[PDB]
């Protein structure tokens, strides 16, 4: 399977006035780990991040080409892009490749740059968007992640409880997947700050 070639997992999770996005740090080629600090979550704005699991080459290409489009949009418009509008932009970019798609399934997490309202979504690899009020997952251990999120997530969590929940969902999910892990990174997005942490995590 093309999507299991590099492995990897991302999720995002909604809280009261905040969002969280997380990712494993492994870059591998089938069984072989190459690197343990590979970037999968990319800033798209001060309070808006995109996480991409899938084929590593397209994780990078989609991030880069999305950035191209985003920078032009912001220079041309007056303003920072809204979360929903970033989703539509990504959707449009992936659907252009409908008959030969990028092998990545992004997740978006952010706050609206005026309201600061929490937003999360994910998209399939041809750009079907999917907005939710709880959590989204993407990657080789999606079933593991669904198990953890459906059992732990609660509404209206504060930044500290949201951090613990997303961290526990990631660590325990990826510990049941051979080709995801070698570290987990978590971003908590608040109105007034970004908290970025790497977790103590299994390295096998």
């Amino acid at each position: 399977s093309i999507m299991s070639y590099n492995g990897g997992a991302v999720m995002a999770m909604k809280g009261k006035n905040c969002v969280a996005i997380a990712a494993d740090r492994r870059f591998g080629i089938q069984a072989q780990m190459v690197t343990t600090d590979f970037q999968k979550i990319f800033p798209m704005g001060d309070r808006l991040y995109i996480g991409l699991a899938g084929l590593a080459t397209d994780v990078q290409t989609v991030a880069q080409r999305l950035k191209f489009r985003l920078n032009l949009y912001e220079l041309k418009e007056g303003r920072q892009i809204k979360p929903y509008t970033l989703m539509s932009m990504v959707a449009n970019l992936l659907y252009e490749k409908r008959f030969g798609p990028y092998y990545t399934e992004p997740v978006i997490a952010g706050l609206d740059p005026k309201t600061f309202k929490p937003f999360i979504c994910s998209l399939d690899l041809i750009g079907c968007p999917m907005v939710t009020d709880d959590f989204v997952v993407s990657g080789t251990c999606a079933e593991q992640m669904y198990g953890m999120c459906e059992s732990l997530w609660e509404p209206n969590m504060d930044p500290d409880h949201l951090f613990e929940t997303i961290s526990q969902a990631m660590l325990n999910a990826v510990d049941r997947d051979a080709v995801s892990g070698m570290g987990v990174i978590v971003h908590i997005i608040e109105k007034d700050k970004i908290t970025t942490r790497t977790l103590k995590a299994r390295m096998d």
Binding site: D124, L125, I126, C128, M130
Partner: peptide
């Protein structure tokens, strides 16, 4: 690919 998601289906309905």
């Amino acid at each position: 690919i998601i289906t309905x």
